[PDB]
Amino acid sequence: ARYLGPKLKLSRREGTDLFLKSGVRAIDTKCKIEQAPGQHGARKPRLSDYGVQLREKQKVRRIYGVLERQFRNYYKEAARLKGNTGENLLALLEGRLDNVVYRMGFGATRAEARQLVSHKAIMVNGRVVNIASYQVSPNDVVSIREKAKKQSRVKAALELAEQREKPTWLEVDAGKMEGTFKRKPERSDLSADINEHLIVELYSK
Amino acid sequence: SARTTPIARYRNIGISAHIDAGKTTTTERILFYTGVNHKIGEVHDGAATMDWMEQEQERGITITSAATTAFWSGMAKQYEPHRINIIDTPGHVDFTIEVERSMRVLDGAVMVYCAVGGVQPQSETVWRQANKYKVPRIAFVNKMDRMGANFLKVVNQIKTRLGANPVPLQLAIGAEEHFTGVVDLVKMKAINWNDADQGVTFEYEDIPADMVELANEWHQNLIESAAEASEELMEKYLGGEELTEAEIKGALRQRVLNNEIILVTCGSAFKNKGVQAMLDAVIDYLPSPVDVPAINGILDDGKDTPAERHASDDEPFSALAFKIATDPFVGNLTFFRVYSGVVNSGDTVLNSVKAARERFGRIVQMHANKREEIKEVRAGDIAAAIGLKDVTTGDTLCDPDAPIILERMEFPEPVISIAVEPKTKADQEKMGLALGRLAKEDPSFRVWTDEESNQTIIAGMGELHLDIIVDRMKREFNVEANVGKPQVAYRETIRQKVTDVEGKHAKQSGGRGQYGHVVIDMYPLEPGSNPKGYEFINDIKGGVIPGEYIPAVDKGIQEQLKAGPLAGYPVVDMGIRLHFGSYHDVDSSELAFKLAASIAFKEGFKKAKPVLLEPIMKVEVETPEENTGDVIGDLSRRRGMLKGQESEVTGVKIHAEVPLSEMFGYATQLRSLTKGRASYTMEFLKYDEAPSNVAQAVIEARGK
Amino acid sequence: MVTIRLARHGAKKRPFYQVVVADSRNARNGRFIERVGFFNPIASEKEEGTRLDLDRIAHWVGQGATISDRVAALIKEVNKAA
Amino acid sequence: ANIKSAKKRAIQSEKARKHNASRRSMMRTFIKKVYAAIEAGDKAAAQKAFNEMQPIVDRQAAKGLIHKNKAARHKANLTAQINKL
RNA sequence: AAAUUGAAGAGUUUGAUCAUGGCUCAGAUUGAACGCUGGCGGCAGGCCUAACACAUGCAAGUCGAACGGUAACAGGAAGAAGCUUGCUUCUUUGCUGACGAGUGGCGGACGGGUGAGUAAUGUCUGGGAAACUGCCUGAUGGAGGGGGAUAACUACUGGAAACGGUAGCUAAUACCGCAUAACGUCGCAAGACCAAAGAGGGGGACCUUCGGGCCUCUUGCCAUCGGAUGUGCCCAGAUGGGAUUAGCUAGUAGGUGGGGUAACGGCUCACCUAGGCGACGAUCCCUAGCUGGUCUGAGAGGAUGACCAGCCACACUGGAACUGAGACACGGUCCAGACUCCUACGGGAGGCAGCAGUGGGGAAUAUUGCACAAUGGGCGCAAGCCUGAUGCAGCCAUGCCGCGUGUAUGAAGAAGGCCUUCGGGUUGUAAAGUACUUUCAGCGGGGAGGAAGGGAGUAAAGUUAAUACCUUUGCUCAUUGACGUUACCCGCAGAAGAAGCACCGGCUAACUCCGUGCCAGCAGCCGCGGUAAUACGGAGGGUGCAAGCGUUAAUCGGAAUUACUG
Ligand SMILES: Nc1nc2c(ncn2[C@@H]2O[C@H](COP(=O)(O)OP(=O)(O)OP(=O)(O)O)[C@@H](O)[C@H]2O)c(=O)[nH]1
Ligand SMILES: [Mg+2]
Ligand SMILES: [Mg+2]
Ligand SMILES: [Mg+2]
Ligand SMILES: [Mg+2]
Ligand SMILES: [Mg+2]
Ligand SMILES: [Mg+2]
Ligand SMILES: [Mg+2]
Ligand SMILES: [Mg+2]
Ligand SMILES: [Mg+2]
Ligand SMILES: [Mg+2]
Numbered sequence A: 001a002r003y004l005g006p007k008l009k010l011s012r013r014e015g016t017d018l019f020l021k022s023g024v025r026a027i028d029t030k031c032k033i034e035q036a037p038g039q040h041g042a043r044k045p046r047l048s049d050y051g052v053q054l055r056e057k058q059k060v061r062r063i064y065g066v067l068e069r070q071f072r073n074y075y076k077e078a079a080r081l082k083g084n085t086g087e088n089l090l091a092l093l094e095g096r097l098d099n100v101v102y103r104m105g106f107g108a109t110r111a112e113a114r115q116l117v118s119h120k121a122i123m124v125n126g127r128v129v130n131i132a133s134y135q136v137s138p139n140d141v142v143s144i145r146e147k148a149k150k151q152s153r154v155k156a157a158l159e160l161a162e163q164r165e166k167p168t169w170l171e172v173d174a175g176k177m178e179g180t181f182k183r184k185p186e187r188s189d190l191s192a193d194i195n196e197h198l199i200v201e202l203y204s205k
Numbered sequence B: 001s002a003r004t005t006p007i008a009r010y011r012n013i014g015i016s017a018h019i020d021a022g023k024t025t026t027t028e029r030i031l032f033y034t035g036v037n038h039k040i041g042e043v044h045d046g047a048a049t050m051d052w053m054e055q056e057q058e059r060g061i062t063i064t065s066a067a068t069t070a071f072w073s074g075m076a077k078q079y080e081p082h083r084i085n086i087i088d089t090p091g092h093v094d095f096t097i098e099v100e101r102s103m104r105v106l107d108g109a110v111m112v113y114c115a116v117g118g119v120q121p122q123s124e125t126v127w128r129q130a131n132k133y134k135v136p137r138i139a140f141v142n143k144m145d146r147m148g149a150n151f152l153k154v155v156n157q158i159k160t161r162l163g164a165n166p167v168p169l170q171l172a173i174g175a176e177e178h179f180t181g182v183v184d185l186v187k188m189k190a191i192n193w194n195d196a197d198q199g200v201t202f203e204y205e206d207i208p209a210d211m212v213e214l215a216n217e218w219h220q221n222l223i224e225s226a227a228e229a230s231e232e233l234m235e236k237y238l239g240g241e242e243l244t245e246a247e248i249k250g251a252l253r254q255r256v257l258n259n260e261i262i263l264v265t266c267g268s269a270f271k272n273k274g275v276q277a278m279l280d281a282v283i284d285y286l287p288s289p290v291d292v293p294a295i296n297g298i299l300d301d302g303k304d305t306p307a308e309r310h311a312s313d314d315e316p317f318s319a320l321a322f323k324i325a326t327d328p329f330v331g332n333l334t335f336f337r338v339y340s341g342v343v344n345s346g347d348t349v350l351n352s353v354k355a356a357r358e359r360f361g362r363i364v365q366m367h368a369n370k371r372e373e374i375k376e377v378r379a380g381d382i383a384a385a386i387g388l389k390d391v392t393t394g395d396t397l398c399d400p401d402a403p404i405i406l407e408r409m410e411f412p413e414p415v416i417s418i419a420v421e422p423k424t425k426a427d428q429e430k431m432g433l434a435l436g437r438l439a440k441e442d443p444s445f446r447v448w449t450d451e452e453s454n455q456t457i458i459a460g461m462g463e464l465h466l467d468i469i470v471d472r473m474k475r476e477f478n479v480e481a482n483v484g485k486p487q488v489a490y491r492e493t494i495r496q497k498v499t500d501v502e503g504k505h506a507k508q509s510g511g512r513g514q515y516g517h518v519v520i521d522m523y524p525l526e527p528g529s530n531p532k533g534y535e536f537i538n539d540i541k542g543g544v545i546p547g548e549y550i551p552a553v554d555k556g557i558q559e560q561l562k563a564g565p566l567a568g569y570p571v572v573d574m575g576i577r578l579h580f581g582s583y584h585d586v587d588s589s590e591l592a593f594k595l596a597a598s599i600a601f602k603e604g605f606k607k608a609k610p611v612l613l614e615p616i617m618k619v620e621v622e623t624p625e626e627n628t629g630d631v632i633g634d635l636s637r638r639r640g641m642l643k644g645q646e647s648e649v650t651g652v653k654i655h656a657e658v659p660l661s662e663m664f665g666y667a668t669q670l671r672s673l674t675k676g677r678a679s680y681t682m683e684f685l686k687y688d689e690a691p692s693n694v695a696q697a698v699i700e701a702r703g704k
Numbered sequence C: 001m002v003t004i005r006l007a008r009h010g011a012k013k014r015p016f017y018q019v020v021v022a023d024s025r026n027a028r029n030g031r032f033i034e035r036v037g038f039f040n041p042i043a044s045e046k047e048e049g050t051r052l053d054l055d056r057i058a059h060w061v062g063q064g065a066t067i068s069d070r071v072a073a074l075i076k077e078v079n080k081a082a
Numbered sequence D: 001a002n003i004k005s006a007k008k009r010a011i012q013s014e015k016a017r018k019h020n021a022s023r024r025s026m027m028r029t030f031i032k033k034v035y036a037a038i039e040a041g042d043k044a045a046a047q048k049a050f051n052e053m054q055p056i057v058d059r060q061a062a063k064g065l066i067h068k069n070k071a072a073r074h075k076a077n078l079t080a081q082i083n084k085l
Numbered sequence E: 001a002a003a004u005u006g007a008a009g010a011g012u013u014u015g016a017u018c019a020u021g022g023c024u025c026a027g028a029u030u031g032a033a034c035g036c037u038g039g040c041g042g043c044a045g046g047c048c049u050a051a052c053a054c055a056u057g058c059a060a061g062u063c064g065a066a067c068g069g070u071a072a073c074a075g076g077a078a079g080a081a082g083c084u085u086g087c088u089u090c091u092u093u094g095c096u097g098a099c100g101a102g103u104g105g106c107g108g109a110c111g112g113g114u115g116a117g118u119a120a121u122g123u124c125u126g127g128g129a130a131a132c133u134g135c136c137u138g139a140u141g142g143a144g145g146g147g148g149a150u151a152a153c154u155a156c157u158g159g160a161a162a163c164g165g166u167a168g169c170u171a172a173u174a175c176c177g178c179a180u181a182a183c184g185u186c187g188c189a190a191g192a193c194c195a196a197a198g199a200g201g202g203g204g205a206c207c208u209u210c211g212g213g214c215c216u217c218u219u220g221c222c223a224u225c226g227g228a229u230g231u232g233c234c235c236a237g238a239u240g241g242g243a244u245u246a247g248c249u250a251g252u253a254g255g256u257g258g259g260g261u262a263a264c265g266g267c268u269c270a271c272c273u274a275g276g277c278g279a280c281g282a283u284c285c286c287u288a289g290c291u292g293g294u295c296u297g298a299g300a301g302g303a304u305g306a307c308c309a310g311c312c313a314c315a316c317u318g319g320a321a322c323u324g325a326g327a328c329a330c331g332g333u334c335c336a337g338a339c340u341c342c343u344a345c346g347g348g349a350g351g352c353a354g355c356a357g358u359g360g361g362g363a364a365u366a367u368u369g370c371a372c373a374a375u376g377g378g379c380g381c382a383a384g385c386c387u388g389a390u391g392c393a394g395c396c397a398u399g400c401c402g403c404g405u406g407u408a409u410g411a412a413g414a415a416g417g418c419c420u421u422c423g424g425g426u427u428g429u430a431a432a433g434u435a436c437u438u439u440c441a442g443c444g445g446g447g448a449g450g451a452a453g454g455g456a457g458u459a460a461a462g463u464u465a466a467u468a469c470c471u472u473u474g475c476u477c478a479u480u481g482a483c484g485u486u487a488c489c490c491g492c493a494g495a496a497g498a499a500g501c502a503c504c505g506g507c508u509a510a511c512u513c514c515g516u517g518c519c520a521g522c523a524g525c526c527g528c529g530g531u532a533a534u535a536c537g538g539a540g541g542g543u544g545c546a547a548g549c550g551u552u553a554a555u556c557g558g559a560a561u562u563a564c565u566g
């Protein structure tokens, strides 16, 4: 149910830094992003229109760490909802608890954030939630359990989070090491290099 | 849920003898006298209850071991009603497994003997099977009505032929037409059974004067073997104070439990005489289940640790599964004798050797075939169980709190084999399932398949064993099958070093034809030269045949080796040399040289000296010494050569190498020459060239 | 006769008793005439675990319906606590 | 039968069959008597037979042998037939 | 406020093109099966075939508060004394706690199963009048007086069994009259006629033949009118295919009268009329349980009737009726047929399309499990008992969902493997190492909820002659859980025990080497394989999925390729 292989091959196939590593090191000093993985990775082929739609879906799936069955269910929920389907899909992926923990900065990676929420370390409104796909509603409180507030991982993750851009729909507090989910982020609040219309196109054939 | 009969009043007795000694007749009479049956049914009329199975009512024999029980109080009801779980076992040599399984669990036995012929070939076999498990046994000389009945001769013959210490508690009043009754030696009274009723009425009488002298002579012999038991009893006998009848019976009982004496009785079951008295002796002398505790030398650890179980209800549960029967409704049926503890219908137990959970669907007390369902079984009785999925004969069933493992006896390794095939052959895997289920019932019956022949080889203890198996498969499983000779595997080899044989396959008619030409030399190869007797030499030099096509001819010879041109037997020890050939540039394929190598191979085979190789198997027969040379004569009649004959003190051992086609059904022939008291072993040794007649025999049949 | 009982819907180890009016000869979760309320024995301390439409229940009693023991205990509890 | 209650019902249904057959035969015998008085052409004997028959069918309709509508139809057709003569 | 916001194509005819036209594929979906692989949990599902045949156990009993009664064990009295005067043993007493068998009442017509039959004595929708309806309710009234039997039982007796046969005795809320009769039935009318059953709890003085009467309370009985529920009946419309099925029908179509039904009616009979249906498809043939729904499709449509729920039909096959409020009755009866079983040979017994399970069939579908704790059902005043309904558990990756098999760091870009135009590139931060974590599994501890009730004591109110008995309402007491070692929570250990499947020529995301050489073989279509094969087999690499992955089968889609939309 999880990908346990090498993580930089995914960013090398997508050709974009998927933030699959902490970033304490420059990414070009770790892997050749401009080269695809494998023996024939130097030859960059002419992808088709089906190819670029599939590559966009695998890119957003490998950023958010979601397998195909759960990602398909997210697409059905986004098209079932009202408004923009792709924007609703991005809001459902950013509503996930591991993504909120990583975006709040309690995890340096979303995979570490998944291990923190899987090991009974994150309390939502004072209740321990052990599911990484727990959808966080607006105006909620996400905190770290008192059993793990003295860990080096969480403070090192907060240092890397203060080294990066702060989200506008979240409040954090490293003193009590808790935080508040304020609202669903709009399309302008997240990254712009994700063409979400390609995902909706892909799931229409 | 209390104890109905005290465990001291249990008797796990059983009958074993030579064929037609009168085992089933005695049990029938017992049931009648004890009140279980309301009529007497004869076995040759097919009306005996113990021979419940068809092919047992028809043939007139007993095949299976049927277990029943009865309640006997004594003639004058001298004791409370004892419960006897009597077991009738077959006497034939084709069903020795049915004795060993029943004598695994019996507490007491009784060796019934024909009066006119006492110790017969199977009497010694059931005696050795009984002393393997150290079973305390009695003796019942049946057929005292038969012409030439001699009771004191058979009590001499058991001692002489089998090496035992028998002391009779009875003396026959009369012979074939004078057998009114028997005089008892521990009472000095005569018991004359009334002819009017079926022997239910037994009149007590005095002893007649000739019998007075003989019975007084034997009565003092009884006291000495009684006084042998203890030095207190020895000083009792030389002290001159006669003896109380309780102490003889106690002393005689003491010697029976330790395999010291035999305590022969007599009677006539077909004339409804001397049966009640036998039952009494079983009460007075055979052990209870409480006597010898069951030493389970394994505590399920893997570190083999000796434990034991005594015979009481308050001990942990331990039982031994000794018989698996097949059933058309419930699958299989598992007989067991509980050594210790109490188990309930519905309780789970532990198959300790297979280490699995086993629940009891229900527990049935057994009559000959019909069942009375019962709630729970105590320690010391025999019952069958429904719903045990994987239990084999000799597996122990215990409570999982105390996992113990009993002795797990060994099976007699069948001696005769046939190849069985269906009539319509559409019932192929139905026969496979049927013989698989029948193999799980009988551990001395083997079924396998041999893919060299793609045949099914049934194996058993005799020809009668296999005849009953195939008839039971036709009736119970509805697979009508025909049997026959198992196909012996042969090989073929050549001689004369045929050389320069050229085979050319050319098929060019326009449009991608195939052309191949090969010239090869075929030479006989010595066996030790190669792991597989096949060497191909690439004598082709500087072209002529391209390197790519050089393996193709080799592969073609290999397929030709698999099926010989003569018949179909695989060719062995063949050396091939590819000295010369021809290759077309545009029409030469792997298959073209394969066809070319096959033409050349066939042509060379006929030019060469091609002979069959039969297999010869090392044979070690063990025989009594009186009929040694007859065995050798039959071996010389089975076209076998001889490498020796050892003469042990137990019997002569002859070694031989007989061809397998002449080793077909040797067990019934070997038993006919030797009163059935010989045995043998076959091991495959080598291959050797067959004579001209048998080689000419296997070629006509295979060819057409 | 016509009775008012509980039809056990819900999930395994999580029951939900639909208070229904039905003739007693039908099945438990079978044919019913009218659903007059519901009962939840695993209610979560903040929201409604029991709701009975007492007007229609009293109307069916006036027709001569039979109230089972659990339904009668729920009516007692509703009329007592409220 | 197999169930104990099934056997008891079987013997009870046969006993009630014997009893109900005698009562149905007696009731039908009185009704045929009224009909024979109709076809023979008498009016007072038919009226007398009706007075003997009317309490019979009323008691059989009361205790549960036939229905009241069946007994009511018998009386209505036979009075409609006594007004014909 | 919200309740539908929805529609992709590609390959293949030709030298090449356009068009037409079929074929094929990409998508969903399933009660699936098979191949490989396989950690956990939740929820759901699980003989689609032989309505093939079935061993065994269980699936419908309950009521002593209807009755005669004791056969079994638990008490109480006469009671010799086990006797050790308390040590309570051996005989009677139905004397009571109860209760085998029997009569009687109620329920067995419900629940459960199956889809054989049925193209309509069916279903769905909408209507209607000519009816019945146990248990449950509203109202008005009665519940008087007798009798004859008979089971059980007693004695004899036939039977291997199944089961009886005789001769006597007895009871009732069993049965049968009589009394009474209206707001009931019949008759416009005067009139005629029709019912019942008692049983328990307690009591103050009376009273008594000593049994009781008597008073009060509860419950049951009968009659009529209703209500509710259930059911029967009728009409209209709709509900498969076939015209290579075009005429069908004489109780047929209608009328009269009799009969019959709970009820109208050719429902039945006698007579009379000669009609009735049919291209708006009668008749005949084949197939089929129907529906809510389910799947697909943008929709229109197409396909389907697994689970759940409603109706229908069926209960070895054929036929029939009885009892009953309700059946032409799954675990009732009778007859006939086939089959199976038992037998002492004279006779008997049975129907898993109930739950489990077996054989057989098949590609294939599970346990001879636990408990009535809860929800219902039957009986009983109640306690309670019965419940293979149900609640659960066991088996199966069968489906859906969730989670895990680690996380961060980590270049000597280690070794090995693969490629190499020999420079190197790739596997690859991948590994090793460093640090951190402990979900799930393992171990140990704690620990809800499903429990409402019911039983004993109480207090008050109602009741009445009574501060009894009963009913209701509050209090107290000790209790009711199959699941179950429950969910859940805590803590110890260590990365620790946890990844495979398919694919890589185009369709379609992913390319090289070696071997093979129109051979082995691959393949859904085009097609590939004759010596440099990105298509075959192995390896490396990559891609897509993931405790699943592929294949097959099956429905729809793409197919505007039956085009109503079009
Ligand atoms: N004259 C006489 N004949 C007997 C006697 N006992 C048995 N027989 C006959 O021998 C045959 C009985 O032998 P069984 O006892 O039935 O055979 P078995 O000894 O039971 O053992 P298996 O044959 O292996 O089954 C029948 O023919 C009997 O009538 C006897 O006491 N006297
Ligand atoms: Mg999943
Ligand atoms: Mg002989
Ligand atoms: Mg014989
Ligand atoms: Mg025998
Ligand atoms: Mg079926
Ligand atoms: Mg009734
Ligand atoms: Mg009257
Ligand atoms: Mg059908
Ligand atoms: Mg469409
Ligand atoms: Mg029935």
Ligand SMILES: [Mg+2]
Pocket (backbone or CB within 6 Å): E330, E331, E352
């Ligand atoms: Mg049945």
Ligand SMILES: [Mg+2]
Pocket (backbone or CB within 6 Å): E352
């Ligand atoms: Mg079944």
Ligand SMILES: [Mg+2]
Pocket (backbone or CB within 6 Å): none
């Ligand atoms: Mg029962």
Ligand SMILES: [Mg+2]
Pocket (backbone or CB within 6 Å): none
């Ligand atoms: Mg290297």
Ligand SMILES: [Mg+2]
Pocket (backbone or CB within 6 Å): none
């Ligand atoms: Mg755990």
Ligand SMILES: [Mg+2]
Pocket (backbone or CB within 6 Å): E449, E451
């Ligand atoms: Mg609780």
Ligand SMILES: [Mg+2]
Pocket (backbone or CB within 6 Å): E559
């Ligand atoms: Mg279409």
